[PDB]
Every structure is written in structure tokens, then in C-alpha cells.
């Protein structure tokens, strides 16, 4: 819903940019100005989309959706608060001004005579008011619905200032365009649309254009011979006093906060003071320590995605089985327990860690078996053999939920199970946090049964039983298949297990990364290779 | 991975803010400056996290994850491009400067004598160079590894300028702090870290502090009686020429782009030109039309979430069944075909549209039946009765996939099926786009069989068969149950159907919004109410 503000922002910026485009060109090539009132069109643009112009068993499913509603609830409140704050600021200036008004004085006759001498050539609509003051240092103007020009008494006391003629024309020019009226109106709208900062940008740009037009007016009424004189009188405006800006709703003559002005102030100021070295020393020390503190927690880099970079403790043989894989790009690893040697296809791919998917069920079962979640006489949660054999997640998810995460972690760590990351979900092995390479599963499965003596003996073979694929006179082939599928595409096909033969004990894993990397294909591929390698021939 | 830049930004802004904090205070209360070199600490802070300081059947599942990797791929390229652009800009200025250097002239004797007269009181390390120029309008300085002060020949021609003493001290002061060295260094770092705009903010702030210190130095060497004179000589710097800023890598004396300066230029410029009205007229016209154009597509508001706001065409009776619902907050609607009257519990809740979930299977079956996706002799995709009866989504998802979306839409529209929105997914009825209220399902189911004669007769009763819950001597109760569950919480329990009795024909729906809003509960609740209402009593 807050997206509506976003839509409004886009509209605003569109119109905003178009106007800026023209402004540049017209000035750049023709020295032309725009009637700034066009900026009201942007405020209007900002409210386009904002206006609603439309012109028997139970079945259930557990869904996940992005909750962006809590965001809008919060954003709504923020918008409200910003408006409240801004209202105050507006008011602050406004109040000052009404109090200021009350302190003004009627202008007397001789001064009036001088003023008329200055403006009689306009014969204007004398529905504006000119007053003097014993307070303010320099002339100002504001609206009140009265259109007031207020001049410090010092400039009448300066009976022969001459320059009065210039300041008067300047003030006249602003009054003429009711700048002080539009400013208020504009600001009110801006206050409400607190969510779009471009409004402040426009607010500010307008002011420069206003002053430029005032200068042109004034010059139009000045004998050019005196333009220099005039310019000098302008410079004088920043030499005597600090600039002031409390009354954001009004117009002053001393120009604005600027580098030049700050410097001029600094020259006048008796600034010849010194400070102890400690000021910088300590700021620097603490700043440093604070960086140190941040560091204690902050770190990151792509290196955290590292796969099985580690060398084997023994010998391995490279093998090519690409005619077998065909389009099913992948890797293959086999290990001989008697030779203490690995046989590897695509040694680069074999090191890449992928979620184990269904082949994690192998380890999951070992863990469930040791913890008596499931056991060798009764493995029911469905049972182990059935669930492994018929692809039942209901069962394995239940085993996982009931294995203390620390037990799982203990064994994932003892066996070097890839990144040993079990995440937080009961289904952590499927396109999720726990990842392992094809080479690692061969290493890991082997250790699970042959080197790691923590596991009960029964857990080791109860698991093998659930994995039997085939048995014959030469060997018994065990393993599990499955596939990680993301957005309907099969991306991670696995077949993991072991072969005990009449000649040796083998561990293996097959992984498919592309083409049609199904579990079934990983199995078929593994079998063809294992047969070619003698594993499934009894050779 | 790009998140790393984000981490860097946070670090940067932390240190940045701390420094700004102190700067304000030290100046505000003690009038103290900082050795700006501390800003290098922020550049260092910006690289904290950046440094990698780490100190048997196949089972498969179809997963969805957020792809933020394409984003990083793109962001990487953008970063590279920004650096390329900035490199050019840097170079542009740099080249200008080397060419400029070559045009400088050695300073002669009398001028040297004057210069030494000015600086003999420093007896400085004369390893810097002073030259004059016949090109530039005002004195400048730069680095080159030479530390050069270059003064236009006009200021030596102005043999009695006097003010030379001031300009020289100013230049000396910048040379002293090697401002021109640090600027380059800083900028180079900034160019690489193109992703964090705060670097530009720092770049700019530094310059003001540099100029302030230069002024202090200069004043320290001036008889205070002349401070006024000095200040006047500063103002003169912006009266004669335009300011220039091509050489961003260097320091000039005419101050900077500013409102005052633009105005002074405008005074000198013969700007008394006029323009045709058409300039604004057409910009305004087109701007308007463009807003019109945007509008043709842009609209939004919360009103699009409207539920079943519409009154019935007949009479309805309010009923309270809150003792039945108990904690299972919900609604209940029943309709009498003979009386043409509705009986409603929680008439507000009954109008709220929710995804129909499994009860959509009712309509889905009608559609599948008419289209011969499934039929009355063979409804297999599992069959209709089984799938309805045993909660099989596999089956219904297949029916949905095979119903032309326009056919479904035709009937959703003829029956006023809530918002009639079937989205885009084969499972659009489950915690998804198609939504309908409890009151609407009663209306809609009724029309499906009693008013809408598009549907085949066989589709109407083939569906009823799959829905039979109970049959007896007084009535046959039909319907379907199910639940929308989100993030494990049951949020939308439904029971929808009809009762044909020995006295009348009833349509009904029960919906549960909170507590334990299961499908089963909606059924139990409906049955208790329907019995109390006489529907399931044959009364
Ligand atoms: Zn003004
Ligand atoms: Zn300077």
C-alpha cells in the first residue's frame, strides 16, 4: 500500500526532470527564465496514482509468503511523525513573525516624501504597507495579508544614504510578485508530502529564481551609468552584519549562509585561541578503538563458499566417464578400501559442495539409529526401510526433528561431512544449508562405517539393509538416490552408497549438475561406471 | 556478495558521524578546528569488513529461493563503469594542468625583491617555486611535485598594488600544508570507492576547513589595524572576473559558485531580453498532457481489497452460533432455495474474501467435467471421487492445468465467484489469487447447480457424488473440507456444500478465521449449526 507513495515519487520525479531540462536549455541558449509557478505542476503530478481512478478428507497446504504489511504499518506511522515535526518548525517561524509585526512603526512624512519620490513613477496600487523599525538591523519583508516592507530606523537617520533608492526598488519587486504568499502556500503542501525529498529541492531552487527576477526589475529602473554603484551597494549588504535565517517564511536582504560569509565573520572574530594536543590525540585513539570494536564482529568474503579444496591423505586416480554421463554433466568418485586409493572423474566438479538432498538420509538414519529415535527392531516414526525405499520425507523429517542438533553436529564433524552446516530446519539436507561434495560423500560414507567407531554396529548395518539396490553372487550394491529441484529444474542429482564384492569394499558417489541431473540418472551412471571399473563385476 | 559494500558503507558512516559530532562541539563551544587528516580514518574504516579476516525410489523436492545473484552480477559491472567515468574526469583536469605549467615564466629581480620583502620573516624552506603568467586572470596554485605559486603579470604591472602582501601570505599558507598534495591522494581513493556518496561529502567539507586555516595564518601576520583593509581586498576577489573551476585538482583565489556570484554576473550582463508567451504556454501544455498520459496507466488504493460488499437480491436472517464456534472464530451462511432467504452468522465476517482452498475443488471439478478433462465414466487424471475424498492435490492440480483459463474465467464470472481471479498457477485456489467469501460460496454453489444452465447436468451431479459426506432417511449431506495454512498456522478453515432434505434444498458454507480454523472444525461447526437450523434434521 505504501507502494502508492513510491508510485507518486516516480510521477513527481518525471515532471521534475522535464522542467529542469527545459530550464537549462532556455537559459543556456536564450537566457530565458520561467514563470516559476510551473513548479505547482509537480506538486500536482505527485498526486496522480494517489487518486483511486479505476478508469471426505480435508485438504490443506502450508504456505510461505512475504510479509510486507508490517512494513507499511510502520511506514504509516513514520509519515505521520514527520508531518508533526515539520508543522512545529513552520509554526515556530510563523509565531515569531506575528510578534515582530506588532513592533513596527508607521512611516512619517519626510520619509514618505522620499519614498514617493522613489516610487511615484510606478503609481502603484498602494494597498501595501511601509513601516520603520527600532529593532532589526537590515530591511525585511513579509506577508500577513498586508504586504509589509519594514526598514530599520537607521536608514532614515541616514538621511543622505542615497542607496535608499536601490533598496526600495528591491523590496517593491518582491511585493509585486507576491513571493511571500506563494512561499507559504508551497510550504504547506510540502509539509504534508513528507516522504519525497525532491520537494525540498524544488522549494530551494525557487528562491534563487525569485531573487534573480528582483534584480532584473531593479536594474530596469536604473540609469546604467550607476550599475556599478548599484552593485557596490549590494556587496555592502554582507559586510556589516551576520546573516540571519530564523524566519524561513520571509525574505531578508543580507543574502545567505555561504563560505564567503563565514570567512568574513571569522575575520572580524577574535579567533586567536589555541588548544591542547590531547583534543586530537584522544579523538584519534577512540576512533581507532571503535573501529577495532566493529571489526570484532564484522567480516565477509566469497571465500566462505569454499568447497572441498583439501587433498586426500592417500592416492587417487583420475578417470574419464564422459561417454557415460553424456549430457548429464556431473562427477564420479570411487574408493578402494584395500588399496587406499580414490578413482576420480572430473576432479574439479567432484570437489563442489551441493546439498546432499535425499542421500543425507543415509547419515540421518545412522544418527536416528544411535539416538533410539528409530532402531533395528522398530524403525517406525513409516519405517526406515520403507521410507528410504519409497521416498518418504514425512518419516525422515520426523527423524531429523528428534535428533539433538548437537548429536548430528558431533557426527557431521567427526566424519568431515562437508561444511557440517545443519542450518535450523528439520529438512536441512534438501536444497539447504548442509552441503557436501561428491568426493566428500565417498570419504565420509567410508568413514561412517569403517573408521568412526562411535556409531553402533547395528546402526551401520541397519542402514545398509535399507539401502540395498541389488544382490548377487559377486556383490551387494547399496545406495540412495534423489534430486534437488529448484523452480521446477532438476539441478542436483545424486546416487550415494557402497559396494561390497567378492574382491574388495568400495565406496562411491555420483553427482549430476546439469542436463537432466535426476537421482535415477546418477544411479544409472554410477552403475555403468562401477561396472566398467570392476566394482560391479567382482573383478 | 555486494552486501559487502553495504557493510563497508555502514562502517564508513559510523566513523563519519563520530567525527562530525566532535567537529560541531569543538567549534561551537571552544572555537576549535581539527587536523583534517583525521578524515583518512574514514577511508580506512570503509575497508574493515572488506578484508577477509576470519579471526530404492528417488526422493526429490521442488524448491523456490530468492535469486539475488543476478543483482550482484549487475552491480559489479556498474561499479566498474563508474570508476571508468571518474578516471576520465580526474585525467581531464590533470592534463590541463600539465599544459598550463609549461606556459609559466620565471619571476624577475625586482619582483623577487618585493616577494622576499614580504616573506623574509619566515626564512622558509625555499624548495617551492614562484612564477608569473601572461595568461590567467588571477593567481592560482598547484602541486606537480614542485609546489607552484603562479601570479598573473598584471599584478606586477600593478607595481604599487600593496595588496600583494596579502595574496602572497594566502598562497604561502596553502603551500605550507601541502593542500594540493593531499587533495590528489584523497581523490584517487575516492575514485575507487565509487559506491559510497559520503566520500564526496567528505571531499567537499575538507575544502572549507582548508580555506579557514589559510585565513587564520594570514591574519596572524597582519597588523590588526589593517584587518579591515584585508577584508576589503578579499571582497575584491569576486568583483572583477567570473569564477572558474575546471581544475578541480587545484586551488584558486576567486572563491566559488554561489548565489551572490551569479547575481553579480547577472548585473554586468546585458540581460534585457524578452521572450514570447508561447514558451511557457507550450511547456505547460505538454507537461499537462504528459501527466494525462501517465494517468492512463497509473492507479492504486486499498479499495482493491474489497470483499463482498454487495447486498443480496432477497431476504437474509442474522443468526448467532457463537457457542458452537467457540474459540474458532469464523462465520456461517445457509440458504433456503424454496424461501429465497439466507441465514447468516457474523454477517461482517461472512463477507470477507479468503482463498477457497480445497473447496475450490468443487468448481474445479465442474469445469474439468464440462471440458472432458475428467468425466462421469472416467474422471481419472487418481479419479474425482478419490481425490476429493482423500485430499489428493496431484489430481486436482492436473485438472486445473488442463482447463483453459478462459473457460474457468467464464464460469467464475457467470457465477460471481468472488473476485474471479484465477491468477496464473495451476493451484490458484490455495492461499492464492482466487478469493471468495463464505456468503459468496453459498450464493455461488447454489447458482452453479440451480441457475447456471451452461454446465452439463452430469457435471452437476457427478460432482455431488464426490462430495457425499452422509446419507440417511431425511437428507444427503454433501461438501468439501480443507485448510489454508501459512507458515505452519491454520488460518482459513472451510466446509462448503449443500444439503438436500425431505423438506427443502439448502446451500451452505462455514469458514473459520482464527483459533484452530481447520477444515474438520469448519465441518463439525457447520453440522452442528445445520442440525440446529433444521437442515440436518429434516425439519
Ligand atoms: Zn530579495
Ligand atoms: Zn585559498
CSV table of C-alpha atoms in Angstrom, one decimal, chain A residues 1 4 7 14-15 18-19 22 26 31-35 38 41 45 48-49 51-54 56-65 170 208 212 215-216 219-220 227 230-231 234-235 238-239 259-260 262-264 266-267 271-272 274-275 279-280 283-284 287 290-291 294-295 298-303 358 361 388-391 393 430-431 466-469 479-488 490 518-520, chain B residues 1 4 7 14-15 18-19 22 26 31-35 38 41 45 48-49 51-54 56-65 170 208 212 215-216 219-220 227 230-231 234-235 238-239 259-260 262-264 266-267 271-272 274-275 279-280 283-284 287 290-291 294-295 298-303 358 361 388-391 393 430-431 466-469 479-488 490 518-520:
chain,number,residue,atom,x,y,z
A,1,UNK,CA,0.0,0.0,0.0
A,4,UNK,CA,1.5,4.1,-3.6
A,7,UNK,CA,4.3,5.5,-7.5
A,14,UNK,CA,9.3,12.6,-14.0
A,15,UNK,CA,7.7,16.0,-14.2
A,18,UNK,CA,11.3,17.6,-17.6
A,19,UNK,CA,11.2,21.0,-16.1
A,22,UNK,CA,14.0,23.0,-20.2
A,26,UNK,CA,16.3,28.1,-22.2
A,31,UNK,CA,19.0,33.5,-21.5
A,32,UNK,CA,15.3,32.9,-20.6
A,33,UNK,CA,13.6,32.4,-17.3
A,34,UNK,CA,10.5,30.5,-16.5
A,35,UNK,CA,7.4,31.6,-14.6
A,38,UNK,CA,5.1,25.8,-13.2
A,41,UNK,CA,2.5,21.2,-11.7
A,45,UNK,CA,1.9,15.4,-10.6
A,48,UNK,CA,-1.6,11.2,-9.8
A,49,UNK,CA,-1.7,7.5,-8.8
A,51,UNK,CA,-6.3,9.2,-6.6
A,52,UNK,CA,-8.3,6.0,-6.9
A,53,UNK,CA,-9.3,6.4,-10.5
A,54,UNK,CA,-10.2,2.9,-11.8
A,56,UNK,CA,-14.4,-36.6,2.6
A,57,UNK,CA,-10.8,-35.9,3.9
A,58,UNK,CA,-9.6,-32.4,4.5
A,59,UNK,CA,-7.1,-30.9,2.1
A,60,UNK,CA,-4.7,-28.4,3.4
A,61,UNK,CA,-1.4,-26.8,2.4
A,62,UNK,CA,1.3,-25.0,4.4
A,63,UNK,CA,2.3,-21.8,2.5
A,64,UNK,CA,5.0,-19.2,2.8
A,65,UNK,CA,4.6,-15.6,1.7
A,170,UNK,CA,14.3,45.7,-4.5
A,208,UNK,CA,17.1,31.7,-6.5
A,212,UNK,CA,17.2,37.0,-10.0
A,215,UNK,CA,17.5,42.2,-9.7
A,216,UNK,CA,16.3,42.4,-13.2
A,219,UNK,CA,18.2,47.3,-13.0
A,220,UNK,CA,15.5,48.1,-15.5
A,227,UNK,CA,25.1,50.0,-12.4
A,230,UNK,CA,24.3,49.6,-7.5
A,231,UNK,CA,26.5,46.5,-7.5
A,234,UNK,CA,24.7,45.0,-3.0
A,235,UNK,CA,28.1,44.0,-1.8
A,238,UNK,CA,27.2,41.4,3.7
A,239,UNK,CA,29.8,43.5,5.3
A,259,UNK,CA,31.6,30.2,2.5
A,260,UNK,CA,32.4,33.8,1.9
A,262,UNK,CA,31.6,32.5,7.1
A,263,UNK,CA,35.1,33.8,6.3
A,264,UNK,CA,34.1,37.4,6.7
A,266,UNK,CA,35.8,34.8,11.0
A,267,UNK,CA,38.0,37.8,10.1
A,271,UNK,CA,39.7,33.8,16.9
A,272,UNK,CA,43.3,33.7,18.1
A,274,UNK,CA,44.9,27.7,20.9
A,275,UNK,CA,44.1,24.1,22.0
A,279,UNK,CA,42.0,17.0,21.8
A,280,UNK,CA,43.1,15.2,18.6
A,283,UNK,CA,39.6,11.6,19.4
A,284,UNK,CA,42.0,9.6,17.2
A,287,UNK,CA,38.1,6.4,16.8
A,290,UNK,CA,35.9,1.9,17.9
A,291,UNK,CA,37.0,0.6,14.5
A,294,UNK,CA,33.4,-3.0,14.9
A,295,UNK,CA,35.9,-5.5,13.5
A,298,UNK,CA,32.3,-7.6,11.0
A,299,UNK,CA,33.7,-9.8,8.3
A,300,UNK,CA,32.7,-11.4,4.9
A,301,UNK,CA,34.1,-12.6,1.5
A,302,UNK,CA,33.2,-15.2,-1.2
A,303,UNK,CA,35.8,-17.5,0.3
A,358,UNK,CA,18.0,-37.5,-0.3
A,361,UNK,CA,19.0,-39.9,4.6
A,388,UNK,CA,14.3,-44.9,2.3
A,389,UNK,CA,12.9,-47.3,-0.3
A,390,UNK,CA,9.7,-45.3,-1.2
A,391,UNK,CA,11.0,-41.7,-0.9
A,393,UNK,CA,10.0,-37.4,3.6
A,430,UNK,CA,17.4,-30.6,0.7
A,431,UNK,CA,18.5,-27.6,-1.3
A,466,UNK,CA,17.5,-50.0,3.9
A,467,UNK,CA,19.9,-49.1,1.0
A,468,UNK,CA,20.2,-52.5,-0.8
A,469,UNK,CA,19.7,-51.9,-4.5
A,479,UNK,CA,22.8,-46.7,-2.0
A,480,UNK,CA,20.2,-43.9,-2.2
A,481,UNK,CA,19.0,-41.7,-5.0
A,482,UNK,CA,17.4,-38.3,-5.1
A,483,UNK,CA,17.2,-34.9,-6.7
A,484,UNK,CA,17.4,-31.3,-5.7
A,485,UNK,CA,14.9,-29.4,-7.9
A,486,UNK,CA,14.6,-25.6,-7.9
A,487,UNK,CA,11.8,-23.8,-9.6
A,488,UNK,CA,11.0,-27.0,-11.5
A,490,UNK,CA,16.5,-30.6,-11.7
A,518,UNK,CA,18.0,-36.8,-11.8
A,519,UNK,CA,18.6,-39.3,-9.0
A,520,UNK,CA,17.8,-42.1,-11.3
B,1,UNK,CA,28.3,-10.6,-2.1
B,4,UNK,CA,29.9,-6.4,1.5
B,7,UNK,CA,28.8,-3.5,5.2
B,14,UNK,CA,29.7,5.3,11.7
B,15,UNK,CA,33.1,6.9,11.8
B,18,UNK,CA,31.5,10.5,15.1
B,19,UNK,CA,33.8,12.9,13.5
B,22,UNK,CA,33.1,16.3,17.6
B,26,UNK,CA,34.6,21.8,19.4
B,31,UNK,CA,36.1,27.5,18.6
B,32,UNK,CA,38.5,24.7,17.8
B,33,UNK,CA,39.5,23.2,14.5
B,34,UNK,CA,40.6,19.7,13.7
B,35,UNK,CA,43.5,18.4,11.9
B,38,UNK,CA,41.5,12.5,10.6
B,41,UNK,CA,40.5,7.3,9.1
B,45,UNK,CA,37.1,2.5,8.2
B,48,UNK,CA,37.0,-3.0,7.5
B,49,UNK,CA,34.6,-5.9,6.5
B,51,UNK,CA,39.2,-7.6,4.4
B,52,UNK,CA,38.6,-11.4,4.8
B,53,UNK,CA,39.7,-11.7,8.4
B,54,UNK,CA,38.1,-14.9,9.7
B,56,UNK,CA,15.2,-47.7,-3.8
B,57,UNK,CA,13.0,-44.9,-5.1
B,58,UNK,CA,14.4,-41.5,-5.8
B,59,UNK,CA,13.5,-38.7,-3.5
B,60,UNK,CA,13.3,-35.2,-4.8
B,61,UNK,CA,11.8,-31.8,-3.9
B,62,UNK,CA,11.0,-28.7,-6.0
B,63,UNK,CA,12.3,-25.6,-4.1
B,64,UNK,CA,12.0,-21.9,-4.5
B,65,UNK,CA,14.7,-19.4,-3.4
B,170,UNK,CA,47.5,33.4,1.4
B,208,UNK,CA,36.2,24.7,3.6
B,212,UNK,CA,39.7,28.8,7.0
B,215,UNK,CA,42.8,32.9,6.6
B,216,UNK,CA,43.9,32.4,10.2
B,219,UNK,CA,45.7,37.3,9.8
B,220,UNK,CA,48.3,36.2,12.3
B,227,UNK,CA,42.2,43.8,9.1
B,230,UNK,CA,42.5,43.0,4.3
B,231,UNK,CA,38.9,42.0,4.3
B,234,UNK,CA,39.1,39.7,-0.1
B,235,UNK,CA,35.9,41.1,-1.4
B,238,UNK,CA,34.8,38.4,-6.8
B,239,UNK,CA,34.2,41.7,-8.4
B,259,UNK,CA,24.2,32.8,-5.4
B,260,UNK,CA,26.0,36.1,-4.8
B,262,UNK,CA,25.7,34.6,-10.0
B,263,UNK,CA,23.9,37.8,-9.2
B,264,UNK,CA,27.0,39.9,-9.7
B,266,UNK,CA,23.9,39.0,-14.0
B,267,UNK,CA,24.3,42.6,-13.1
B,271,UNK,CA,20.3,40.7,-19.9
B,272,UNK,CA,17.5,42.9,-21.1
B,274,UNK,CA,12.3,39.3,-23.8
B,275,UNK,CA,10.5,36.1,-24.8
B,279,UNK,CA,7.5,29.3,-24.4
B,280,UNK,CA,5.5,28.8,-21.2
B,283,UNK,CA,5.8,23.7,-21.8
B,284,UNK,CA,2.7,23.9,-19.6
B,287,UNK,CA,3.6,18.9,-19.2
B,290,UNK,CA,2.3,14.0,-20.1
B,291,UNK,CA,0.6,13.8,-16.7
B,294,UNK,CA,1.0,8.7,-17.1
B,295,UNK,CA,-2.5,8.5,-15.6
B,298,UNK,CA,-1.1,4.6,-13.1
B,299,UNK,CA,-3.6,3.9,-10.3
B,300,UNK,CA,-3.9,2.2,-6.9
B,301,UNK,CA,-5.7,2.2,-3.5
B,302,UNK,CA,-6.7,-0.2,-0.6
B,303,UNK,CA,-10.2,-0.3,-2.1
B,358,UNK,CA,-9.8,-27.1,-1.1
B,361,UNK,CA,-12.2,-28.4,-5.9
B,388,UNK,CA,-11.9,-35.2,-3.4
B,389,UNK,CA,-12.4,-37.9,-0.8
B,390,UNK,CA,-8.7,-38.5,0.1
B,391,UNK,CA,-7.2,-34.9,-0.3
B,393,UNK,CA,-3.7,-32.3,-4.9
B,430,UNK,CA,-4.9,-22.3,-2.2
B,431,UNK,CA,-3.6,-19.3,-0.2
B,466,UNK,CA,-17.7,-37.0,-4.9
B,467,UNK,CA,-18.9,-34.7,-2.1
B,468,UNK,CA,-21.2,-37.0,-0.2
B,469,UNK,CA,-20.5,-36.9,3.5
B,479,UNK,CA,-19.4,-31.0,0.9
B,480,UNK,CA,-15.7,-30.5,1.0
B,481,UNK,CA,-13.3,-29.5,3.7
B,482,UNK,CA,-9.8,-28.1,3.8
B,483,UNK,CA,-7.4,-25.6,5.3
B,484,UNK,CA,-5.2,-22.7,4.2
B,485,UNK,CA,-2.1,-22.9,6.4
B,486,UNK,CA,0.6,-20.2,6.3
B,487,UNK,CA,4.0,-20.6,8.0
B,488,UNK,CA,2.5,-23.6,9.9
B,490,UNK,CA,-4.0,-22.7,10.2
B,518,UNK,CA,-9.2,-26.4,10.4
B,519,UNK,CA,-11.3,-27.9,7.7
B,520,UNK,CA,-12.5,-30.6,10.1
